[PDB]
Subunit: 413 residues, 4 copies
């Protein structure tokens, strides 16, 4: 019926009461209650009346979903989950292997197009890829009394011993923290330090923050007058467009290529190698340059990154820098009727452990590509492998869309 005061289980009815009582704040329901799902039920209830159209929540799934794995490190105020259609494209004949690429999307033709692109590649002898570099970064802003002081610190960080003490501090942070280079940049009395380190099969944004922080402390011991303004002074750079990610790289840098047989271009892609190339240059090069792009000399690399990212538990917001990509197309073969295509992506921020990678459905798409979890034997291998697949699939998508654009097929589909 109704009651009052904390006790045993109680009822949705008035457990709500104690929330108004302001002793059980909304987001703490899982703290108190016994079953995660009840918690979400009660919140959807609270939130329900907070709503203008309370009948909304009705078609928002939530029932039976392992929440023990989200509550804790993947989301707060869980009021359910969002279903994203997951299509599959492939096989992707990449580096003498075939992958069935999962793509969580809501945009029609994206999967169809990526597939059509994978096809051209398969009938083309397949594609080759190489991870050019690997390292997640973090660039805090630090301050000194005078620019002359910043200057001194910069020089110090650049001496071999100085770098060694910073590296030691940094690496003592984790099992995988192994500080590579150190890129410093001065702005008056400000000093931006770009820390770069590998991180096994983790995307490493977290590991690196812990590492730079410990390093900044040891750095402070030497320059007590230094102010650590913010672990992140946008010099990483994370989730924001930045020429530095494009030029210096961030995460995994990777190249991709394939040669599509003139026949395959006419048959599968429905155009000409000559037409493709004529479009790639004036679109992905001259066009992008005209729009003042930094890092976006590609057709829709983003569409492919986001889809794979959502499907495989990556940070869909890193879609920003991860999509950097220049796609190039040349005439090739004995008659120059064959299409040579490459795709270079300098900043693929990706990981195979932690984050959304810990959820089971996302993990399903990872296993589907045989990348899931940490690579015990060779640490970082899964992350790297996935990076290559992302780059490979992007080339596939680039191939198909570019073709469609050349052929005048975009409006039809």
């Amino acid at each position: 019926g109704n009651a009052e005061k904390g006790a045993k289980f109680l009822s949705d009815a008035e457990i709500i009461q104690l929330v108004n009582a302001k002793h059980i704040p909304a987001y703490k329901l899982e703290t108190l209650i016994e079953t995660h799902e009840r918690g979400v039920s009660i919140r959807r209830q609270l939130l329900s009346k907070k709503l203008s159209e309370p009948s909304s929540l009705q078609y928002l799934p939530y029932r039976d979903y392992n929440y023990s794995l989200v509550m804790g490190a993947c989301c707060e105020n869980v009021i359910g989950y969002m279903p994203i259609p997951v299509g599959v494209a492939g096989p992707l004949c990449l580096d003498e292997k075939e992958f069935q690429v999962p793509m969580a999307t809501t945009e029609g033709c994206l999967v169809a197009s990526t597939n059509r692109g994978c096809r051209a590649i398969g009938l083309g002898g397949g594609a080759s890829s190489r991870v050019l570099a690997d390292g997640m970064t973090r660039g805090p802003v630090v301050r000194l009394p005078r620019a002359c002081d910043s200057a001194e610190v910069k020089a110090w960080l650049e001496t071999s011993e100085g770098f060694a003490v910073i590296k030691e501090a940094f690496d003592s942070t984790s099992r995988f923290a192994r500080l590579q280079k150190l890129h410093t940049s001065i702005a008056g009395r400000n000093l931006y330090i770009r820390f770069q380190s590998r991180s096994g099969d983790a995307m490493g944004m977290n590991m690196i923050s812990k590492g730079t922080e410990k390093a900044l402390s040891k750095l402070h011991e030497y320059f007590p007058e230094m102010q650590i303004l913010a672990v992140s002074g946008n010099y990483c750079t994370d989730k924001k467009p930045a020429a530095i990610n494009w030029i210096e790289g961030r995460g995994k840098s990777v190249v991709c290529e394939a040669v599509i047989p003139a026949k395959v271009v006419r048959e599968v892609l429905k155009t000409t190698t000559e037409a493709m190339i004529e479009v790639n240059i004036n679109k992905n090069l001259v066009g992008s340059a005209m729009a003042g792009s930094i890092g976006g000399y590609n057709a829709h690399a983003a569409n492919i990154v986001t889809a794979i990212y959502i499907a495989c538990g990556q940070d869909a917001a890193q879609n920003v820098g991860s999509s950097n990509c220049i796609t190039l197309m040349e005439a090739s073969g004995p008659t120059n009727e064959d299409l040579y295509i490459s795709c270079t992506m300098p900043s693929i921020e990706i990981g195979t452990v932690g984050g959304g990678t810990n959820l089971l459905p996302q993990q399903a798409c990872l296993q589907m590509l045989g990348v899931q979890g940490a690579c015990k034997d060779n640490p970082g291998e899964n992350a790297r492998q996935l990076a290559r697949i992302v780059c490979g699939t992007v080339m596939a998508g680039e191939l198909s869309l570019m073709a469609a654009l050349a052929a005048g097929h975009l409006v039809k589909s």
Copy 2:
């Protein structure tokens, strides 16, 4: 029809009927996906990989033929809620589909500071989706002529006529042209009701390019999209000219609220905003990213509300500014300007029911009958508002030395 499950399998195999064909071949969407999963498993190095990828009893009737191909199931993204967001004297319960811990918590904490601050105000500065095809002429002198033509009032009128005759909402605004030798990049800009409009615009520019061709028969239409729109790629033009909805946001957090809720000082916030979001971003050579994590907020809301999560690229453009304010300058004045929010309230993933749930939750869902475009615009303002909230909280945490404490 009935044929044993594996009977369809073998059948397809022996015919080599492309899996994607299924939906048409088989009766009932869930069969075709269940069968596809089945075919796929045998192509995998661990046939039981999809053991945890849901797919059962989902509404594929909407999806197939409109949102995704080769469906093999669906991906569950935790959906949190933040708010109320006291924006323009209203309160919104903002849904955020994410997998990053603290994002919702932080956006909430940010919304809180704003609520106890008298709320936030926002304005949509401009509205217009764009499409910029590449077109070619024999000589640059010809491109030149076309450019001048498109710039005459009559020339623009015939192009506009053609363009607008494309849809009920297609109303071509300006026309930005740009020459590269014999190449001509034409940026078409038009409103589009409550639709994000990427599709409507393509239809419009295409019809317009035809009418344009009638006048310059020697013109080659190389591609409806010559990257001058620009869509899903970083571009100074979206930042400077705007794309989609441009919107400003502001709020003033009372010094007490900054010390109590945000756990810092207005002075500290400002010292960080300038050297991070301004000097830092400039040092990294950013174009459009003078903000802390506008992207985190856009993506979350975008995924939760059926938007194109890949447009996260240009939609996240945002400059966040913080000034000292009040009688004592202890209050925090904060603003966030986002010039290119590509958003829509109709079509796309906006047609799926669960996404529609999050849209109703903000009372934006579907087309706005009375005032077309209103929902799209309203949602844009909410995205900008929530972004400011997130900016507030994260900036604070950074000032206070809390990122490696919260996470």
Copy 3:
């Protein structure tokens, strides 16, 4: 007056006179300069380091109070000539004030290929100098309101009237506004006859900002220039929106001419242009610099013709493109598009006689009485033309493996 350099210096050393005023006193420019050199030598660690800095017999008359302060002589810059430049069915002998060897030789070699190629064609795509002040309002909602106001036809009309009432040539074109919170950046665009117009425009935006103030009394005019013009700084907005004169250029070099004059192959040129001026520039994160050395050509012509050599920054923006052309695709099609050539044929260094010499040499000097702006525009085209010429030659040299040696 007439005393003695020997003592006209003491008063000065009695600080009764600031070196930078000798002019006001000692009426006879060269003497003013003369005394100042002497007074400076003493302050120098090497009292005679100015031994070789010319100064005599230069017409400081026009310089003083309009081009330079604290004058102490002049700097001689070698002036070479390149051409003829067969541009738009005309031939120009282009003057280039430079100190870099081969620049003139190369630009010439480039002009040559063009002459034996049927010549080059050019078009001025747009014309308008800009000024973008920063203005402030109490709240962003206020900025917003002003933006919308400036965008209404009547609002623009009152702003335009105010702006145009500033000068005989001030004819405000569009108005590009941009909001940053409670800040509002207004880009004013207007023609300006044959003047580069940086000054004319400032005067115009200022009068306009006043009338704007009358309507929004709560608006703070922070600075007539809030870097949204943008002047003398790299900016995507100049590249995308244009600034000054925007112009295209093209020519087709006959395969024979490429092999003979330029010493390479159209195929090789093209292979280099794409991977250097496009893919390379993109790799370096360039905004506006998809060209080989457009700057070398702009600066030289700018110094020789009295332009603002510092505007070399935005004026050099240029994308140079090369395609295969002809019945056999062995001919080289080349184009050069420069969106922001800040140039003028009147005022500034354009008032000095030696610079004016180089202007007449191109028949552009002074204002074009009949068709105002024509000289400025014509010169802009020549700058673009000569740039293509230089692009042609250097690209070739690079293709052929000739830079070093």
Copy 4:
């Protein structure tokens, strides 16, 4: 030797290239004197070079080194600003310009600094760069070369080759960048007191050869694939630096700001942020967070024989202003310039008048004892003077003193 009208006809007939005139006439000046007559016919107005100087210049130092087809020289007013109290020294900075108030303003700025205890500067890095484009059959090959160049031994053989090129060629790091089967290699080396554009090209070329020995299938497309980057705007110069990177700072006493600069520290700062930061960002600038660093670079560059076209990358500069002092009434100002391409030897640095302005700053020629010192010292002066000019113009803008001066 004999006669003029004759050399002409003789020329016109056997039609000799005007540019060869120097190798057929006893004195240079009669070469350029003939050249000039010879060109006058070819003008719409034969009497155009009337006022264009030429006599008694000493083309000797120019011929075959600084300029071709010389028809004379261009006089650029040279003003002086200072003293510049930089690093406990005072410099009298020469500025070759044609823009009124530039010198006056830079002076006024130097003044505020002098009465402020002076300015401090530091050279953060030194290295000229060259980035050729090289090609391989497949991207996998490019990839392999990149990794090779990154191994310590691979770098050692490349460095050896590179350094064996000159006495000052000492290859620092190596920044590589892949674009499919393309490979952009950024070579970085010091170069004494030379700007080093030439030395580096010779070095990368020698290195690219040795590189070829290891990857015979590699195509050297161009010694310069715009990844240096030279004379074009590029985020890489801004982020990685090019030439000399230097910081500058000073603190102007609140009194001095009100008295000399005619404003408030609070006003200055309010303008710097919304103009040089927020404004520049709104215009989509990469590298230009400053008011007019270019004006100062160009002037000093022309006066001291530097490459005025490098004005493009050399002008990169972010200027910052904070409140300082016991009451925060004092103005703290800094200026960071990451890519000052400068040199004190070779180029226009070999001409005597330019050398005059170099001595004036006591930088002229190579620094025997400490190689590179002069180049570096001049770089610091350029950065110092830029801060000075930033100070004055920013002030003027804050105070609303522009249009009228």
